[PDB]
Design a binder for this molecule. Sequence first.
Ligand SMILES: N[C@@H](CCC(=O)O)C(=O)O
Lengths: 64, 61, 256
Amino acid sequence: YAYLLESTMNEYIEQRKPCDTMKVGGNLDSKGYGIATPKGSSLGNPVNLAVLKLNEQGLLDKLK
Amino acid sequence: GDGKYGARDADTKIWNGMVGELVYGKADIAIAPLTITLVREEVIDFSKPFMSLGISIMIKK
Amino acid sequence: KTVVVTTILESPYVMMKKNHEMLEGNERYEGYCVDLAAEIAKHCGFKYKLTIVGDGKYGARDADTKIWNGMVGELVYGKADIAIAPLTITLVREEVIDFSKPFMSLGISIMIKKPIESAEDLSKQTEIAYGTLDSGSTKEFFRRSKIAVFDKMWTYMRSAEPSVFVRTTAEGVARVRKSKGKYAYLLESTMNEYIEQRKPCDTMKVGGNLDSKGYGIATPKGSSLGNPVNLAVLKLNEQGLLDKLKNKWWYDKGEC
Ligand SMILES: N[C@@H](CCC(=O)O)C(=O)O
């Protein structure tokens, strides 16, 4: 049994005991995870700016 | 509550998962490994991506 | 209302066709962004005219006048309705213009002439000169970077004499090529890997990306087009088109 999942989760499991799984081949597509809010939410604009600010400062890479 | 990411039920038309909690106003924001897709963006808003990824294959060594 | 599209002659996004002389209007161009424009215009139901950014720049804000140049400036001052180009979604730009979700992922990388293996290596020597493109997001990345190595690299670049900065990507690439390995160029992975697969096959991308960002289709704040184009980008990515165009212009055309 082989499992189709997002590269992020695959890479995480590949580093966990019992270290018996592995990610193979290239990614099938390219996409992203985003912080979601209800349509027309007040928070939308500010959280988008926060995500951009935090990626630019190196925090997102640091956290991964 | 339902431990799901979010999908619209073809028969019932209801959105489940985190997406549903946002759509029906149970939550104000979803901070999770929630993929930005076209069908979701039609009902909720997404920030630019905080993480880049792609579907891949996991095998037993 | 014919949509004025601002773009930039940057391979392989927008390039003049071999036979441009006998061609007119949108027909004179070809590339990833030319096919992308045709595609989103198809899905959004609009007619358009491709125009090359007058000043040949991506977009930066002059600290003295506060005036935006490049494609950003053309959008900000209403000279163009939409920018379909390899334009990087950044915080400063997002404050003055709208960006669709990314149509392409990328990161800053190093281009060497066929002794440097990474950013850290450039920051430890003075023999090999290195710089970036003027008026772009790569130069800003280093200007606003606190990460020790990137901060240290900027301090060297900022003060560099002669200037290690270039007007166009083509200028940076040509400089690496004629410098006998004494100049490395910092540019986006997308453009780096394209050139890597083009004659004279004398360059190469080294190390991993310095960051993870994306290019987005830009429109002026409050634009009626914004909503539709964003959904169009998502549709095209999901239909598999973006991947198809990427392989079409990068590797089916690779000559190395
Ligand atoms: N894509 C960059 C230009 C290229 C670069 O700065 O390396 C921008 O949108 O400014």
